[PDB]
Design a binder for these strands. Structure first.
Ligand SMILES: [Mg+2]
Ligand SMILES: [Mg+2]
Ligand SMILES: [Mg+2]
Ligand SMILES: [Mg+2]
Lengths: 213, 190, 457, 256, 40, 107, 226, 180, 251
RNA sequence: AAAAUUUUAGGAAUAGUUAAUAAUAAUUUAUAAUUUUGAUUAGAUUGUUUUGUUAAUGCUAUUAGAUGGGUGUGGAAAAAUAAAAAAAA
């Protein structure tokens, strides 16, 4: 918005200064890992956990915290839900989109995400695995999605996983994949016990951007 | 009304004019100790309980109460009590962890005098400067691990002898000769 | 005893100007900003932060008294380092504005001359990046779960992901004042001075500058001529000083302010404003030596043109004679609407001009004043669904309704307009509601809530 | 079951993500302790940073303490090379030859026109600064990284005569950059970090070598002790690698 | 509470409450009046 | 680099970090081989999840599913008590059988 | 919160309302959104005394010994039909009778046409599930001569409160597309003789005299003698 | 949101709810009974002190003869007295800024004091509750309605800032010669 | 209710209470529900002022390689009916889908046909809408659509490319909500029009001797009602408006 | 998240265990952690404005109320009789 161009322009004018001595690092503190409160809070790199009244010199950001979005199928008791999971890397400024894929693959801790090949895309347009973040104007604020192989098949009943509510789960597939891990047959402590949202939660029509009634 | 005699009482529901509305807790109850165990067999190794045990904390005679005024508050303005401590580093066996012995103060109002007690803390030194026998400044902070709420704020006095002792490959300080006391007699010869 | 930084001084001088009290700004100046310098070739550009920040050597810690070791964050300590970006030219500008506002020519001439000279002959200071605390660094969010634009089937809901309503008020499309070059800041400074002239004129004659509350609105005030003279001399002073350099910078905001001064103080019909603006732009394309390719009047300028037309046709409503309306002496609706029409033709022609609610409002108002009786159709085609509105629309529109042939049309049109108000989230204002109430004997339209009336009695 | 239910190291809030996002819309997952991993662990070091205009131009000359013959340092660095090359021989182009080992006290850009005025004037000021300073015994242990893990060096511990160095350097810093305006890549009111550069990746090399020296090589030597050295000799050197087989030396000062 | 009169719409059900709040138009008008007063 | 920052709150290791100085005591082989073992975690991990995705996905299955099984699923003052046996001693004999003593550390 | 009753005025809990806002008060429960509902209990509640003396069969009783006289079957069908309309008529019971499943017709619920309340629904399209009397029904809402821009699922289509009026002019074939009827302020120029506005945003109705009589005869102003 | 509701003392919303000004006292023989005006939360616990925001005062519901003042032949003064202590800075804070609620009995009290108008529950059963019709109300409103600006300024003075600066104190506060 | 600050409660990996991510299925009617009211707005824009990529001369051609990094999001209008190559053709005859194009076909160009085109590899989509006849809007001369023969040969088509099963964001329609005035009503007073002399002003309201005809007397409704819609927080119709104003609900 | 204050006449060892790594490890790495400045088990006991005596540093009382997890709802578990809290006209 306004911030982005205000600070961009500020940086760009700062770089064209003929006369500047350079900052004194005894006057330019780092950040503290030690502050009150139990939680450990990660902030912007321009920001500190103490009060600093003075505005520090604009720096180019050498580690850009990209966010890459995935679609997961979350099991809730009623049936499957399709929701969103972000993976966040720190990708060096000049890095190549291939390398961004690689960093993204290493950083995900969920078993259900990276199984097949995925393509990075912005507003539905694929990115060249060949070229730099610089060219595509990728910043933290930029919205990056990720698209799997079978994702364009999800409108069918096949690729989309089958919920034991409406579908047979057989000794074929009891031993394979999220079904196996889930332990469909109830145990005393009830197995891994997944989040549940009921059937009448959204009414007769499911969740939408547009009000349908 | 607590200032009125036994016979002077009329109503028990209100204070007529002013003063303190006081409930009488009955202090003399003749409470007693029940003896459930033989003097031979008492079911504890280190200590035996034969009488009525005094209870509470600060209700405990003779009263021992927290004393804010000591060396530590003398030097520091603390936002919260115990937010600053000065102590000595005792041992570093744990990476990025300095154990620190510190003194604090207790006041006995009966005898009108103070005692110094001592307490150990785990402090977090990133970068591992602290050598056993350093005089350090220590502060309260973010919870770091199960037992570490404190970090090393500044080394007041480093240990120069200990550091040069390390540089030569030797331990910072000689290991204590005897460990904890025992109730046995160890006969170990040659 | 907190020493104000340059930013703080700016703010307080803004308060001074708007208050028009020179005697505040003078003491403030004298006390704090005196030694404030400009930036020269030998100056070092944004000065590094030099402060140590506060620590204690072990001897300082142990041997000092309690208070010498007490650090509360004290504004005074970093004042030097808040000032490290050299915002001085702003202070000088504000101070010019004040000396003008308090009606003193010599002092104003002084500050403005210093400023002009420095802007011409000295380097442009490096701007400060956006203050983390005043304005907040935008934090990352996915915009996925959001009420869609069409979420409510009855209207256009604006949304966090994009704006479908369109701009309610025209914005100037210039970066924050500190990001300007020195020449650009010279221009900006002149437009600022003009704006203060205008404000002072409106504080001296609030009656004449308010639209259509009095017939006094249609006629130049005496003292308007000396004012416009001042403005003339000022602008020609700007063309005298800046040379060919003017060809390279944005004159848009300057123009719109110029136009608004010649619309308000001197009162010029819409055609006179368009003429004036075109002559100005020709002047700017000619001083730079080139092939032309004139920049067109930007949206804000056109806003001043149109509001010029609306000033042209304006009525004092409801004389105590139960006489309908008074109009500007020597008023021709035909001419006015002629020029307005081909002007809107011109605007809608140019693809780079973004429309806003206020522009439409000026047009609509000119339509009502002209007795066009097309005001409705324009409003419903171009505005109603696709913008967020004031109730000012419905005010002038009501004046339009009132003039139709039979009564029933009046009534029904008015009622329908209220329904519009309920549908589109216009909170129909008190002014409008009073306008409707006045005719209650004729139209029988109830404007008040039940509860409101009860409570009232 | 073998520890805290919620391990304390895993409690992390990301404030650089918008408020409300993590509660409803989506959850954000990251390995957050790669970033939180500190300056001691990574081995980074914060050098005096250049203003952009100075950052544009290559450095030409530098101040150096010359290491004498028969050093503890040179010997142990040779031992370290042996070990590293036996582990991974992809290091071979990264490593600096033991012949070029020197202590870097500061770096500077001299333009080629004013060259002689500047070298004479510098040399003189340098000789005046170091007039009173007797030789310096400094201690080397530990490794560190400059320029995002591209430069791998041996730290100079502030346990010894180092203190004196700091005043000494800060004087020439205030002469060479303060008095006669010269481009020291930093501020003259700031002190440079002295170091012995061991491995380095130049721009040309970077393609075949990679963008950062993998920490797996030097992890074990990170805190290794290279020993003590006394230093009598200060040089101002231009960087030419073929003139004498050692950095081409434009000026010299003896500490005695 | 919300007052439920006897001439509210009777719900014939054995599985739940016997009387649904639904108002005779009279009751609505009345309620409006009382509530105007308390608005005052 | 021996002093901490009063206004900043940052420790001495922090201002030492910022001035680009390193105070560190000479280390024995313990601390050296611990640190040199820890430094490399991410390279080992990157190599693991590049070159061997199935093994990784197995372990992850176990972790992810574990998060739903177990004692506490959500973090509250009870769950997020750093010292569980200490703050609830009143549970230790009867209800909670995991711990046999109320104190495992200084406090 | 977004839209309070009488602004915040707290002098009584009842002063607020029966719901604080139109919007759901907890975010975790969306269905708490303020709707316009309908007395489902009474309006389902079909009359079982209509099925007295009938002898219905079931679906899966196909047996030869089980079924009955064709006359008995016919009066059974008529009894069942009377049982289904016994409350009012469901949309899907109205729509199957009209041409083109009643596309284009205006379906008003009884209470939408009485008092100052004026509202109806133009039918855009219909999905009959296998069971009639149920389904989904989409359309445009028209409230006081002001119409929706896009179609919407008609709420409470299953509850039997609905009436409509068949007009050949409004009929649309399944081939074409049902146009939204014009909102009277915008698309069609406002006319008094064609359409007059019942009630408008600040209006409300005068007092009907029998209500007044009754309320005074309640509060004890006007006397009432046994 | 309790699984088995506490049946006897229900409330509205979660506890602790918006602070409400209550009258409460321990129950005793009627001859000695006093009450406490107390700002506290909506959901009380066993002892009323746990949620107690402020203590507004004592109120004694026993008409008293005034023996503090000299016996006065004035008719009205020798009616019995009813004594109450109000803390009105805290009251105006809590009620005004914090937006409290009010039970009815304290309302009757503070009405007697002149802090509040008489409550909703105080009924002369002589008069009925009024009727309303909008056209008559409208005629009365068209009959009397003040000017817009007058009304806006009244709302300004009552709700927003009261204390304003006359031109005089301006002239007296603006700097003189050496810095003017 | 406001959105709470951050989630410290549940592990991130597991993600727990999360509004489902809405995804647009092209096989259902729901797709068109999303896309339709945008199209109309889009066309409206095209009728007033020019937008650059809206009008192409011919079908866009790209290699297989660059297919999915160029096409998705692209929306352009063509004069004739020609269906993009390597696209399987689906006719949309199902009435529920057709339904949402109602407003667009009545108050803008009549919709002749709708087509769902899916690429053979199945990962791309083209929504193709064929309009018949001239706009029911007036068309400006300098406007984009004035360069088209199908408006102002009477058939012409809109083409919209998109990925299947994506959120109704990355079909990019929201860039188009720029709003330009239709200058048709003022075209009367321009110096170009010869009907500008047939115009006459009404400056003053005409003397009126009669009040508006009074509304028919109010019949109080006879059936049961759900209670005050004020107190139930129901907006005036259950339709639109603010809950404070109870107009037009029964009483 | 912590800091202080913590009882038994005759006194010994305690343990899903410390610290670093990390959304690791039922077998990661380490010279680990608690204790005689009194631990852990075990007895007794409802913890830091409430009483009684007294000229007085003292002695002598103070109730009651937070008892783990196992589809985890809720803003917060405080959620299975036992009010004396007006709980959407
Ligand atoms: Mg603890
Ligand atoms: Mg026990
Ligand atoms: Mg709220
Ligand atoms: Mg249980």
């Amino acid at each position: 918005g306004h911030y982005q161009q205000e600070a961009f322009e500020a940086r760009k004018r700062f770089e064209e200064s003929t006369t500047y001595p350079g900052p004194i690092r005894a006057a330019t503190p780092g950040d503290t890992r030690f502050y009150s409160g139990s939680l450990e809070s990660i902030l912007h790199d321009t920001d500190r956990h103490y009060w600093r009244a003075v505005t520090d010199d604009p720096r180019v950001q050498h580690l850009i915290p990209l966010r890459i979005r995935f679609k997961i199928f979350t099991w809730v008791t009623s049936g499957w839900e399709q929701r969103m999971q972000v993976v966040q890397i720190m990708a060096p400024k000049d890095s190549t989109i291939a390398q961004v894929k690689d960093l993204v693959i290493v950083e995900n801790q969920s078993p259900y995400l990276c199984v097949s090949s995925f393509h990075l895309a912005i507003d539905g347009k694929e990115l060249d695995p060949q070229k730099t973040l610089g060219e595509y104007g990728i910043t933290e604020q930029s919205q990056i999605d990720a698209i799997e192989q079978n994702d364009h098949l999800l409108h069918r009943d096949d690729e989309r996983p089958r919920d034991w509510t409406v579908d047979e789960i057989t000794a074929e597939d009891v031993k394979r994949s999220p079904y196996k891990e889930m332990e469909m047959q109830p145990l005393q402590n009830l197995a891994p016990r997944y989040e549940a949202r009921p059937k009448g939660y959204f009414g007769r029509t499911y969740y939408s951007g547009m009000k349908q009634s | 009304p607590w200032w009125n005699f036994q016979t002077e009482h009329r109503q028990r529901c209100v204070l007529m004019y002013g003063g303190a509305r006081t409930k009488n807790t009955h202090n003399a109850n003749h409470r007693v100790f029940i003896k459930k165990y033989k003097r031979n067999a008492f079911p504890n190794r280190t200590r035996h309980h034969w009488a009525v045990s005094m209870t509470g904390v600060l209700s405990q005679r003779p009263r021992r109460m927290p004393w804010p005024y000591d060396l530590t508050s003398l030097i520091f303005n603390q936002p919260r009590q115990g937010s600053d401590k000065i102590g000595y580093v005792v041992g570093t066996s744990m990476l990025k962890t300095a154990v620190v012995a510190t003194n604090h103060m207790v006041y006995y109002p009966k005898f009108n005098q103070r005692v110094s007690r001592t307490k150990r803390f785990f402090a977090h030194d990133e970068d591992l400067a602290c050598v056993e026998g350093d005089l350090v400044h220590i502060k309260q902070c973010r919870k770091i691990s199960k037992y570490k709420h404190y970090y090393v704020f500044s080394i007041l006095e480093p240990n120069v002898e200990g550091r040069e002792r390390l540089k030569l490959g030797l331990k910072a300080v000689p290991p204590p000769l005897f460990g904890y006391p025992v109730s046995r007699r160890i006969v170990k010869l040659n | 005893q907190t020493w104000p930084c340059t930013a703080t001084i700016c703010a307080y001088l803004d308060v001074c100007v708007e208050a028009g009290e020179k005697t505040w700004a003078m003491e403030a100046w004298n006390r704090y900003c005196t030694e404030l310098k400009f930036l020269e070739p030998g100056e070092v550009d944004p000065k590094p932060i030099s402060r140590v920040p506060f620590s204690l050597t072990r001897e300082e810690l142990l041997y000092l008294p309690k208070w010498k070791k007490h650090f509360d964050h004290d504004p005074n300590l970093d004042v030097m380092d808040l000032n490290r970006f050299n915002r001085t030219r702003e202070v000088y500008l504000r101070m010019a504005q004040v000396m003008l506002a308090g009606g003193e020519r010599n002092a104003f001439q002084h500050f403005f001359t210093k400023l002009e000279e420095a802007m011409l002959n000295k380097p442009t200071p490096v701007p400060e990046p956006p203050n983390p605390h005043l304005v907040r660094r935008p934090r990352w969010a996915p915009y996925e779960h959001c009420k869609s634009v069409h979420h409510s089937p009855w209207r256009l809901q604006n949304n966090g992901r994009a704006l479908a309503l369109g701009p309610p008020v025209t914005i100037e499309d210039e970066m924050q004042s500190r990001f300007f070059s020195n020449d650009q800041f010279l221009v900006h400074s002149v437009k600022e001075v003009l704006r203060i002239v205008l404000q002072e004129h409106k504080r001296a004659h609030p009656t004449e500058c308010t639209r259509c509350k009095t017939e006094a609105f249609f006629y130049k005030t005496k003292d308007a001529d000396e004012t416009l003279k001042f403005c003339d001399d000022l602008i020609e002073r700007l063309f005298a000083s800046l040379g060919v350099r003017l060809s390279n910078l944005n004159t848009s905001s300057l123009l719109s302010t110029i136009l608004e001064v010649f619309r308000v103080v001197g009162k010029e019909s819409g055609a006179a404003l368009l003429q004036r603006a075109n002559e100005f732009l020709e002047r700017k394309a000619s001083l730079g030596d080139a092939e032309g390719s004139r920049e067109n009047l930007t949206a804000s300028n056109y806003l001043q043109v149109l509001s010029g037309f609306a000033d042209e046709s304006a009525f004092v409503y409801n004389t105590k004679k139960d006489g309908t309306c008074q109009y500007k002496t020597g008023f021709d609706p035909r001419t006015t609407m002629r020029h307005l029409a081909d002007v809107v033709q011109e605007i809608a022609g140019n693809p780079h001009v973004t429309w806003a609610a206020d522009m439409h409002l000026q047009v609509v108002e000119t339509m009502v004043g002209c007795g066009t009786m097309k005001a409705n159709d324009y409003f419903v085609r171009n505005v109603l669904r696709q913008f967020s509105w004031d109730s000012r629309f419905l005010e002038a529109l009501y004046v339009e309704y009132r003039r139709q042939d039979d009564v029933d049309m009046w009534a029904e049109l008015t009622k329908r307009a209220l329904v519009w108000t309920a549908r589109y989230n216009a909170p129909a204002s008190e002014r409008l509601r009073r306008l409707i109430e006045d005719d209650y004997d004729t139209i029988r339209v109830q404007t008040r809530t039940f509860r409101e009336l009860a409570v009232f009695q | 079951e073998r520890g805290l239910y919620f391990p304390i190291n895993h409690r992390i809030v990301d404030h650089r993500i918008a408020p409300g996002v993590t509660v409803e819309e989506t959850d954000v997952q990251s390995r957050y302790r790669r970033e939180l991993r500190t300056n001691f662990a990574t081995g980074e070091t914060r050098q005096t940073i250049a203003p952009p205009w100075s950052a544009r131009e290559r450095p030409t000359h530098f101040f150096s303490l010359r290491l004498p013959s028969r050093n503890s340092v040179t010997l142990r660095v040779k031992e370290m090379h042996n070990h590293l090359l036996f582990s991974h021989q992809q290091c071979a182009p990264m490593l600096v030859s033991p012949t070029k080992l020197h202590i870097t006290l500061g770096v500077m850009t001299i333009p080629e026109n004013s060259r002689e005025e500047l070298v004479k004037n510098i040399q003189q000021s340098m000789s005046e600064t170091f007039a009173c300073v007797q030789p310096l015994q400094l201690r080397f242990r530990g490794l560190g990284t400059f320029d995002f893990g591209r430069v791998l060096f041996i730290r100079v511990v502030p346990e010894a005569d180092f203190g004196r160095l700091e005043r000494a350097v800060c004087d020439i810093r205030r002469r060479v950059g303060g008095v006669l305006g010269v481009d020291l890549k930093g501020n003259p009111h700031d002190s440079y970090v002295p170091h012995v550069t061991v491995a380095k990746i130049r721009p040309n090399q970077r393609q075949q070598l990679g963008d950062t020296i993998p920490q797996s090589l030097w992890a074990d030597y990170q805190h290794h002790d290279f020993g003590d050295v006394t230093l009598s000799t200060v040089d101002l050197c231009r960087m030419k690698g073929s003139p004498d087989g050692y950095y081409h030396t434009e000026g010299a000062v003896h500490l005695s | 509470r919300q007052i439920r009169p006897y001439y509210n719409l009777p719900s014939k059900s054995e599985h739940g409450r016997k009387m649904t709040g639904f108002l005779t138009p009279y009751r609505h008008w009345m309620w409006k009046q009382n509530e105007l007063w308390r608005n005052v | 680099g021996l002093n901490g920052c009063v206004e900043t709150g940052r420790s001495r290791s922090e201002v030492a970090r910022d001035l680009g100085l390193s105070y560190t005591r000479p280390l024995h082989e313990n601390e050296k081989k611990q640190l040199s073992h820890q430094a490399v975690y991410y390279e080992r991990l990157a190599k693991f999840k590049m070159e061997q995705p199935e093994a990784a996905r197995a372990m992850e299955r176990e972790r992810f599913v574990r998060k739903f099984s177990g004692m506490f699923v959500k973090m509250d003052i009870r769950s997020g008590a750093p010292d569980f046996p200490s703050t609830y001693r009143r549970l230790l004999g009867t209800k909670v059988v995991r711990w046999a003593s109320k104190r495992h550390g200084p406090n | 919160r977004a839209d309070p009753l009488n602004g915040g005025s707290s002098m009584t809990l009842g002063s607020k309302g029966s719901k604080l806002s139109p919007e759901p008060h907890r975010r975790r429960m969306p269905w708490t959104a303020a709707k316009e509902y309908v007395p489902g209990v009474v309006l389902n509640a079909r009359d079982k005394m209509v099925l007295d003396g009938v002898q219905l069969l079931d679906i899966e009783s196909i047996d030869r010994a089980s079924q009955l006289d064709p006359l008995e079957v016919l009066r059974a069908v008529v009894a069942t039909r009377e049982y289904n309309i016994s409350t009012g008529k469901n949309i899907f019971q109205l729509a199957s009778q009209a041409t083109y499943n009643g596309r284009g017709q205006r379906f008003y619920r009884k209470e939408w046409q009485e008092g100052t309340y004026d509202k109806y629904v133009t039918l855009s399209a219909i999905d009959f599930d296998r069971d009639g009397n149920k389904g989904t029904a989409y359309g445009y809402i028209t409230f006081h001569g002001e119409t929706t821009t896009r179609p919407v699922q008609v709420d409470f289509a299953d509850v039997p409160g609905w009436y409509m009026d068949f007009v050949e002019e409004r009929a649309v074939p399944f081939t074409g597309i049902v146009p939204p009827p014009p909102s009277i302020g915008t698309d069609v120029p406002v006319d008094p003789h064609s359409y007059r506005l019942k009630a408008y945003p600040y209006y409300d109705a005068p007092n009907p005299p029998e209500f007044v009589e009754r309320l005074l005869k309640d509060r004890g102003v006007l006397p009432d003698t046994p | 949101a309790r699984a088995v509701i506490k049946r006897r003392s229900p409330q509205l919303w979660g506890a602790p709810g918006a602070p409400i000004i209550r009258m409460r006292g321990h129950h005793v023989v009627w001859k000695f009974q006093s009450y406490d005006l107390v700002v506290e939360h909506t959901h009380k616990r066993r002892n009323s002190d746990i949620r107690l925001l402020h203590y507004l005062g004592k109120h004694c519901p026993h008409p008293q003869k005034s023996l503090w003042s000299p016996d006065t032949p004035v008719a009205q003064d020798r009616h019995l007295f009813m004594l109450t202590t109000v803390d009105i800075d805290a009251f105006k804070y809590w009620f005004g800024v914090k937006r409290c609620r009010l039970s009815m009995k304290p309302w009757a009290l503070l009405a007697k004091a002149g802090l509040l108008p008489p409550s909703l529950t105080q009924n002369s059963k002589i008069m009925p509750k009024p009727l309303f019709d909008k056209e008559s109300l409208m005629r009365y409103y068209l009959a009397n309605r003040k000017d817009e600006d007058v009304m806006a300024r009244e709302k300004y003075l009552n709700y927003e800032n009261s204390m304003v600066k006359t031109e005089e104190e301006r002239a007296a506060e603006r700097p003189v010669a050496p810095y003017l | 209710s406001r959105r709470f600050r951050y989630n410290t409660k549940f592990p991130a990996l597991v993600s727990y209470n999360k509004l489902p991510w809405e995804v647009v299925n092209h096989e259902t009617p729901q797709f068109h529900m999303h896309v339709a009211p945008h199209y109309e707005q889009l066309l409206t824009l095209a009728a007033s002022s020019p937008v650059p990529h809206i009008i192409g001369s011919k079908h866009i051609d790209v290699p297989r390689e660059h297919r999915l990094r160029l096409l998705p999001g692209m929306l352009y209008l063509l004069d004739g009916d020609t269906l993009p190559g390597e696209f399987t053709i689906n006719r949309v005859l199902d009435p529920t889908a057709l339904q949402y194009y109602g407003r667009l076909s009545s108050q803008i160009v009549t919709v002749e046909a709708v087509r769902m085109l899916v690429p053979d590899d199945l990962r791309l989509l083209c929504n193709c809408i064929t309009f018949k006849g001239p706009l029911h809007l007036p068309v400006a001369p300098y406007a984009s659509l004035a360069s088209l023969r199908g408006a102002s040969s009477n058939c012409f088509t809109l083409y919209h490319f998109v990925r299947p099963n994506r959120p109704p964001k990355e079909l990019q329609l929201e860039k188009y909500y720029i709003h330009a005035p239709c200058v048709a009503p003022l075209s009367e007073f321009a110096s170009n029009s010869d009907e500008r002399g047939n115009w006459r002003p009404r400056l003053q309201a005409p003397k009126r001797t009669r009040r508006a005809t009074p509304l028919p007397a109010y019949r109080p409704p006879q059936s049961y009602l759900m209670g005050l819609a004020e107190r139930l927080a129901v907006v005036p119709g259950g339709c639109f408006g603010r809950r404070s104003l109870m107009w037009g609900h029964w009483f």
